[PDB]
Amino acid sequence: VNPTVFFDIAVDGEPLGRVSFELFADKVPKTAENFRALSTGEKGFGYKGSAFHRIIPGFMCQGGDFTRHNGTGGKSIYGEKFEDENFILKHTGPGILSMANAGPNTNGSQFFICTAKTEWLDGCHVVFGKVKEGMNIVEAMERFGSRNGKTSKKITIADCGQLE
């Protein structure tokens, strides 16, 4: 009964493809619901139109900063930040969807998609979902990143929402 959400990705405005995610509401319901609601925009704000501002090949793609567009902003549906719900799920390999943060209990809206196993983030970042379809689209996004994370073209969430 886990929800599924989609991102339609564009590269400098040109459509690239769709990434879908299973959200592990059965294990992290509060964290899953935040990402789900931000993907539908049903609270009046969310991910549509925002970018993947930090992409590091061989590591991860990070996005979700829809207030400052550079990794310093974002907010959750619960307030500016919320607690680390739990660390039941681990960063087991590519496709893992996990919360970005700035220290303990500072989850907002920013998230990252792993493109490799990042086990050293276990117990520091809350894992709450995984890529279902379109990992090939994530891999194509990865090629526009760089060592320091700056992107060579603008990688945007042109549309997003909930499936099923």
Strand content: 25-35%
Query: What can be said about the biggest beta sheet?
Result: 8 strands, antiparallel
> What is the distance, rounded to the nearest whole angstrom, between the alpha carbons of the first and last residues?
11 Å
Calculate Rg over CA atoms.
14 Å
Q: What class do helices, strands and sheet pairing give?
A: alpha+beta
Count of separate DSSP helical elements: 2
Shape call: globular
Strand order of the largest sheet: 3-4-6-5-7-2-1-8
Number of domains: 1
> How many strands in all?
8
Helical content class: 10-25%
Q: Summarize the helix and strand pattern as letters.
A: EEHEEEEEHE
Oligomer: monomer
PDB class: cytosolic protein
Keywords: Peptidylprolyl isomerase, cyclophilin, cytosolic protein
Assembly: monomeric
Entry title: Human Cyclophilin A double mutant C52AK125C
Explain what this protein looks like in three dimensions.
The protein is α+β, with helices and mostly antiparallel strands and 164 residues long. The protein has one domain. 12% of the residues lie in helices and 29% in strands. The protein has helices at 29-40, 135-142, and strands at 4-11, 14-23, 54-56, 60-63, 96-99, 111-114, 127-131, 155-163. An 8-stranded antiparallel β-sheet has the order 3-4-6-5-7-2-1-8. The radius of gyration is 14 Å and the shape is globular.
Blueprint of the fold:
Layout: E1 4-11, E2 14-23, H1 29-40, E3 54-56, E4 60-63, E5 96-99, E6 111-114, E7 127-131, H2 135-142, E8 155-163
Antiparallel strand pairs: 1-2, 1-8, 2-7, 3-4, 4-6, 5-6, 5-7
Family: Belongs to the cyclophilin-type PPIase family. PPIase A subfamily.
EC number: 5.2.1.8
Pfam families: Pro_isomerase
